[PDB]
Design a protein around this ligand. Sequence first.
Ligand SMILES: Cc1cc2nc3c(=O)[nH]c(=O)nc-3n(C[C@H](O)[C@H](O)[C@H](O)COP(=O)(O)OP(=O)(O)OC[C@H]3O[C@@H](n4cnc5c(N)ncnc54)[C@H](O)[C@@H]3O)c2cc1C
Ligand SMILES: Cc1cc2nc3c(=O)[nH]c(=O)nc-3n(C[C@H](O)[C@H](O)[C@H](O)COP(=O)(O)OP(=O)(O)OC[C@H]3O[C@@H](n4cnc5c(N)ncnc54)[C@H](O)[C@@H]3O)c2cc1C
Ligand SMILES: Cc1cc2nc3c(=O)[nH]c(=O)nc-3n(C[C@H](O)[C@H](O)[C@H](O)COP(=O)(O)OP(=O)(O)OC[C@H]3O[C@@H](n4cnc5c(N)ncnc54)[C@H](O)[C@@H]3O)c2cc1C
Ligand SMILES: Cc1cc2nc3c(=O)[nH]c(=O)nc-3n(C[C@H](O)[C@H](O)[C@H](O)COP(=O)(O)OP(=O)(O)OC[C@H]3O[C@@H](n4cnc5c(N)ncnc54)[C@H](O)[C@@H]3O)c2cc1C
Lengths: 381, 381, 381, 381
Amino acid sequence: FDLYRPTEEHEALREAIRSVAEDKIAPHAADVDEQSRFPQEAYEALRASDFHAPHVAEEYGGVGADALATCIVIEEIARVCASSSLIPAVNKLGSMPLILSGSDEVKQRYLPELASGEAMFSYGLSEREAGSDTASMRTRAVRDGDDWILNGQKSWITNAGISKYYTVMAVTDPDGPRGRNISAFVVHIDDPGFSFGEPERKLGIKGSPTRELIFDNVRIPGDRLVGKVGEGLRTALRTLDHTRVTIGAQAVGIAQGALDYALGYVKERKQFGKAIADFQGIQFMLADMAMKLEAARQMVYVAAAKSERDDADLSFYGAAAKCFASDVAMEITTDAVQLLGGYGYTRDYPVERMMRDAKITQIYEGTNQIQRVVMARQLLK
Amino acid sequence: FDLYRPTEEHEALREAIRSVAEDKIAPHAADVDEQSRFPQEAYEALRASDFHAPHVAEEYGGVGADALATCIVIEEIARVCASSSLIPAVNKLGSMPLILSGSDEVKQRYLPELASGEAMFSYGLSEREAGSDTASMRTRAVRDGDDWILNGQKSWITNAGISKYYTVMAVTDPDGPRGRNISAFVVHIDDPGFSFGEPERKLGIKGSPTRELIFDNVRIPGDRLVGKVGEGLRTALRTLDHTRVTIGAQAVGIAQGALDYALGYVKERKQFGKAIADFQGIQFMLADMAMKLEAARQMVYVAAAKSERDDADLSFYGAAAKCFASDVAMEITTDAVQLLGGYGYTRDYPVERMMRDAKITQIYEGTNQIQRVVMARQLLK
Amino acid sequence: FDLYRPTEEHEALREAIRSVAEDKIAPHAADVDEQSRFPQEAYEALRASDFHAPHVAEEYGGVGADALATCIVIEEIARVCASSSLIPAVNKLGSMPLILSGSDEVKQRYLPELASGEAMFSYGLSEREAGSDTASMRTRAVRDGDDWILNGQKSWITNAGISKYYTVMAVTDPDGPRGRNISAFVVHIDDPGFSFGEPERKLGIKGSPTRELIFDNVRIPGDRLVGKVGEGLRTALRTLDHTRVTIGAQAVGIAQGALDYALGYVKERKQFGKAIADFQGIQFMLADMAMKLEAARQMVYVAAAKSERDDADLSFYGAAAKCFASDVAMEITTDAVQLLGGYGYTRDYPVERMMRDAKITQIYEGTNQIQRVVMARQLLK
Amino acid sequence: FDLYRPTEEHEALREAIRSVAEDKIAPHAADVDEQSRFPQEAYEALRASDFHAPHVAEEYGGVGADALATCIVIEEIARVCASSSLIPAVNKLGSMPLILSGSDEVKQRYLPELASGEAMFSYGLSEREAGSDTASMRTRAVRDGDDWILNGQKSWITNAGISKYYTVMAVTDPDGPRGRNISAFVVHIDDPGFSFGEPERKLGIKGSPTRELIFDNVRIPGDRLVGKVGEGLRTALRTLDHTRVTIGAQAVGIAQGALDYALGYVKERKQFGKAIADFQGIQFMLADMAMKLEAARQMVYVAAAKSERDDADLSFYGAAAKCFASDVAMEITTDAVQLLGGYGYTRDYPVERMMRDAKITQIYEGTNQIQRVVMARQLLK
Ligand SMILES: Cc1cc2nc3c(=O)[nH]c(=O)nc-3n(C[C@H](O)[C@H](O)[C@H](O)COP(=O)(O)OP(=O)(O)OC[C@H]3O[C@@H](n4cnc5c(N)ncnc54)[C@H](O)[C@@H]3O)c2cc1C
Ligand SMILES: Cc1cc2nc3c(=O)[nH]c(=O)nc-3n(C[C@H](O)[C@H](O)[C@H](O)COP(=O)(O)OP(=O)(O)OC[C@H]3O[C@@H](n4cnc5c(N)ncnc54)[C@H](O)[C@@H]3O)c2cc1C
Ligand SMILES: Cc1cc2nc3c(=O)[nH]c(=O)nc-3n(C[C@H](O)[C@H](O)[C@H](O)COP(=O)(O)OP(=O)(O)OC[C@H]3O[C@@H](n4cnc5c(N)ncnc54)[C@H](O)[C@@H]3O)c2cc1C
Ligand SMILES: Cc1cc2nc3c(=O)[nH]c(=O)nc-3n(C[C@H](O)[C@H](O)[C@H](O)COP(=O)(O)OP(=O)(O)OC[C@H]3O[C@@H](n4cnc5c(N)ncnc54)[C@H](O)[C@@H]3O)c2cc1C
């Protein structure tokens, strides 16, 4: 009766990413946060075990992992290092427009370099004046012969400066219809007129570089176009339907690491002559953390299976999975700090970092407010 | 990619129980509550379509439905009538000790009558002084030759007076070890010295009879014994591991009926010149209801698949599924009343009944407090 | 240091209403709910001790109680019988438009009969198509010589059929400006063309009659006019600023009765060899109930003192006090049922009635959704 | 009608501390957090306006501010800089044992230096193995002639290394009765054998030094004794009854600063062509923040008035006020980050610091779990 569980192959994958995460990523997580530096040790360990971008098709040299397998990878990394989990999460985000909409030529150019780990991808959608409202974006792409000229800026770009390739959405007709006047382009780190802003100083995922992209008359070839002129925002929304699920998986892993840590601690710490775990108020808090986490996990996996099949109700299930898991991770990490007492408030234990990291999952890949808008729309239509 | 969803056969089953529920059960639900009367129309409709006790093995004339199929049945009935949903839920509860522990003879005597719908089963575990603490039960069974003499009382017995057979747990050795001095027996409605208390006057599931069992020197044959002398409470705990999942399914169905009703209403009701559904605060409430309901549903189905396979972590997953779903149903039904305004507070709409019914799911089949104890124990061991 | 507490006189008043409530009201509360009948024993006890309408000025034969004293009265009654608490709460609601806007003649006609207890007042604002949106009300009043002719209907009217006088708001100019085309009138139970609908069948406050008013060409004298033609809705909003505070006080009293009952019970009930009160998970639930209740109480009293002084921020504080207290009462009463287990779900204990009653406090005197709208408006302006 | 509000004098005080806070403290708050450095600019501004230790009696050169005035001071500072708010909060904590239990001589020695601002006080109660369980503390004080010899360690000491005087509790008889074998002593920064641990690396209140005290055969005179030998822990518990209220006030101020910031931002930020404040889901979030904050504020002020009068129910009201306000501040600051979107997650806005700071209020001055224990005990006795 093989219902409502991952395959044996999924559980073998879980065990393999967990070994890489616990051995090679976990020891660097505190230093990555504390120095706000790219998790380079994690990148090398993930590249060596083909966990840096596992979703890429076997035809491009990739692992060809299904959406659920890719979720389990992001979850198991996020359990020890949220910054590291963004390597496969943002590699999928930046590549998904090519995978969903790109010509065979565009895919053949870029996906093999992702698969081999020679390049990371970033995704440039958000702006200073258009964050949630991406249809109002002002970055523009203008034909000049066979070339495109890009002018404007993207805000908040994960892995900027480390990524070699940038999937960028820009307005291709300022007079075209709202939502259907945008196109997607692959931009290279050394394209002319392309600079980075100063790294953002963040609450959490501090090792993950977060930087503005500045486009000053960036001239790129005509073959950088991903999909059809004007269909870029449709491609971006379709991308979001898959990638929101992976942030739900990230939220689940962060919450799981915090719960793992809190459970180990309250079994050992003694006060008033017994283990903290022996206090029934503590037992109720642990049961709440575990029940909500497990509900969030199963909902992420249901949305992941929907992502793999492209189920017609993926928008609802993905928006629900991402909003629920991030809300639950925020609550669980706030309680994991609580359960360690004073120790929990110090950077000598990892639970305060896990709480600071959990907060991003409620904001990026669609704010939980936008997620509630999307859910209500899917219910009422 | 057939992961994390019910089978096509499960969805055909869902459609068939939903037709019986909407056509034959739903029209009587208000009158069943209002007159506090047994849902007789629902019993006949369920018996005619073999949905009254679908878990019974095909070898006993039963449907042989898996634990997930049985959950979907209880859910789809509970969506229109919570009292009616207790026909298959309590038929499973009362029969499960026979199915888990009974001799071939005991099973052959009782299960065919359940399968055909000639008899309903009840489960007599709780008492006046031993509710949560069932190991402290005082009802006693004493050998008299080949017979057993039962003395005491059971409290809160669902379907009492309607059920023909009562699976009753009693102390078989007041000096034996705590938890291992109890045995299970099948008691018949016409066994001598066996009476019923006055029906309880309840907040909700008002059509479901709830009555004390009084045992005054009840003499029954030796072959009424279910399993081994002293193993009755082990059988009762094992039963609970499966049946808690079905109350989670009941909670999911009640919440789904309330959400279905609230969604239909806020699309039609207009205030300040627009549909109530057009207010973003309302949209956020609907998204919260739907997200939490969907998380509770997937968690119930994960626990149901664990029940079918007898997964070693069934205790955790069942306790989590039942506690989560009932907590979520309490919150959703309280908001469904809210969303109808004044109308919601009147018995002319069904959402106030759905709120009164939701509250029982937090109490029976282990209080949500006992569920948190069980969850914490499974985490810490 | 006499800061942040009621006066000694307030505490003497509290003790006096508590005696009347515990001796004369509490014994009838269950029967009042169970038979859905007016709390006549409570009315007579309240009239005999001048607690039926204590806010009326001493110049009209009244007690002249301040807004805080009147809150304490409603709270102490609502602790034992929510239906009874609506006698002074709705007596204030129906009289407040006369007190805020009425001529000396109108006040002199009606307030002495309220003060003596010869008449109760009702308030007719809501309609079938205009509940939250009262500015869209369709009930009309048309001059005919010195008379007014009323046509339409009011929905949900508390104490209808028992009250002698009805303060009714009606459109006095269907072409006048939105919100400034409505007037208030005193309607008598025996005015011609005036009938009542069938009593609503409610979730709770079942003894409180709730009935439609039907106006079929109701001819009333010109001197029935309360305040100025067109200022009726301004008077209604001003009324709401004071009366919302009294529903917050009602919510506090219902929650207090449920907590009083739960605390007494968990000290006595034993399971697993100790008092339920000895379980730390239970202690945490009790601390949550008590802390939230006490916060809600102090906020109601702060809003009551604002009501007495007519502080410029009364809208915010009243809306906050009513929304907070009713939300907290819903949560506390749902947990009070929980803490009694099975007993809590039966009508033999009062906590299920207290939960059914608590739910109305979130809906009437402005839904908690309208309260959040009002709060946000006061913050942002 | 002067009920349920601060005095005119309190509101003049509020305006005066708010000017010092907005002009002199607020500009340094970000740099204080970012460099984890003592808020020296705030200390000088507070000392110059007599807001560094306002509770000290006029007989010692102090302001003599009542407990409510002192709460308003801590609140108004905590609104702009939580680290700065600990100057008057910890000055009261460390001095309160002298004020409650000290001889006239001890008070005359130390309180004038606090009043003038020549010295800050710290409080040394907690240890590595005795945090919540202070009766199990192991730091010892041993008579040697007229001297005392202190040996052990205190953990988590706020303002350590900056404070000149340390009120330290130590075991004076390892064989005396539990809770009645502890005494309080004033320790000087230059007492022999007295060192500090390395500053803790914290989630928030990063400018507030937090350091272990190490006592290696610390010899101090007999006149350092505060109160009676063996009554130190009674003095510590009594201190906590007053000081918990001031952490509730701190939590209120942090939440108020976050709400002030979020409200200003959502009025200005536009998305989808309107102000964020114009979205009703946002309006509901703002109403929730404001209602809960206002309930927490009024409850803190009720507990403060109880602290001033020494009301017999101060334990309950203080524990409730501190637990409620800190829980509410955690929720409000987490939502204030949310409402700024990406900006909220960056250290360029202050709301992420306010969230990191809010988390300490749930842990120190008795964890919210200990607060629920204390509340339950006061309810059940
Ligand atoms: C660390 C970080 C990493 C990121 N990574 C990337 C990335 O790699 N690539 C990329 O393109 N983007 C990225 N983002 C951008 C992120 O998706 C945006 O911050 C988010 O979309 C919100 O936009 P905003 O920050 O402008 O907030 P705004 O859109 O200004 O929203 C502000 C507030 O208003 C609310 N709001 C907005 N619209 C509505 C509405 N219609 N109804 C109700 N409430 C509403 C929001 O929920 C929020 O609470 C990242 C963000 C951060 C902080
Ligand atoms: C309508 C209805 C139908 C029922 N149907 C059946 C049925 O068919 N057959 C049957 O045998 N039973 C049935 N039950 C019984 C039900 O399972 C019991 O009510 C439940 O087990 C609780 O027992 P109690 O009511 O005695 O509460 P108690 O056990 O007295 O508990 C009272 C309160 O204390 C809490 N509590 C108890 N122990 C602990 C602990 N260790 N830690 C923390 N908190 C604790 C509980 O959660 C509860 O909040 C039914 C109950 C009802 C009301
Ligand atoms: C038992 C009872 C007693 C009452 N007593 C009286 C009385 O004595 N006199 C009297 O005149 N009235 C009385 N009322 C009426 C009561 O005030 C109304 O029910 C209430 O105002 C809501 O109106 P409605 O029921 O038409 O709900 P609707 O206004 O139809 O609202 C339905 C739902 O939409 C929500 N909603 C409405 N507008 C908005 C908005 N702008 N933004 C977001 N959500 C919105 C509501 O909060 C609610 O959840 C009573 C009601 C009841 C049930
Ligand atoms: C930044 C900071 C500043 C501080 N300032 C000072 C100060 O100036 N002076 C000073 O003396 N102290 C100070 N403290 C100490 C603070 O009061 C302690 O951290 C707190 O008392 C908890 O002790 P602990 O950290 O050892 O946690 P523990 O006592 O080990 O508790 C760990 C967890 O168990 C829970 N727990 C403990 N006992 C029970 C129980 N009986 N029932 C249920 N749950 C329980 C706790 O709530 C917590 O969640 C400070 C702490 C910090 C972090």
